[PDB]
Amino acid sequence: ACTKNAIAQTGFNKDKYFNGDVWYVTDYLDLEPDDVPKRYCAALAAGTASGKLKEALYHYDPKTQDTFYDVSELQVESLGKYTANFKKVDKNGNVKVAVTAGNYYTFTVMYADDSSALIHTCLHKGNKDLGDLYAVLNRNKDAAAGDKVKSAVSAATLEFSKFISTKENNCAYDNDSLKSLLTK
Ligand code: FDE
DSSP states (O other): OOOOOOOOOTTOOHHHHTEEEEEEEEEEEESSGGGSOSSOEEEEEEEEETTEEEEEEEEEOTTTOOEEEEEEEEEEEETTEEEEEEEEEOTTOOEEEOOOTTOEEEEEEEEEOSSEEEEEEEEEOTTOOOOEEEEEEESSTTOOOOHHHHHHHHHTTOOGGGOEEOTTSOOOOOHHHHHHHTTO
């Protein structure tokens, strides 16, 4: 189960974060660490599409090759904190699993600048038991975490040393499909 009420960035700039571009997960921390593999690839696009706040997600397990994309229209709880009922889609936006009740994640932007961010998520999916998952994001898939985002990790009373890097997994991303999925 999730246990954290993550605090959104003071002065969060929504239009900059939700600009239609891609964010790569470079490091992550699950508080129930067996919930996610030790090796992983994820990325997201975030933007407004025809007036609707959207995210598109990509997950890839570099060992098993399990792949999936998702799309959500985000609802606002407050500036920088969102709830997102998701649908599983192929890379072209064709629905594989429809939106339903009980399938949603919360999403809080704890820190962001133009190039890096720290988020918290809490996934709810059916009867699964999932925990708090923090992710360091960058606009450049290869960027080492800089001092601004690492300081934000400390300010959330977390230790960056505990985060697991995605950088040694040979992750390759389809940026084009993430951007187009925003419209779907
Ligand atoms: C490492 C990592 C990282 C991440 C990130 C993320 C973010 C930022 C967000 C998210 C979300 C999500 N996820 Fe995530 N992630 C991960 C992981 C994961 C996994 C393993 C899974 C599967 C689960 C189950 O089903 O059990 C997921 C999962 C997930 C999901 C679901 C999808 C479907 O369709 O089913 C979602 C919605 N993810 N995510």
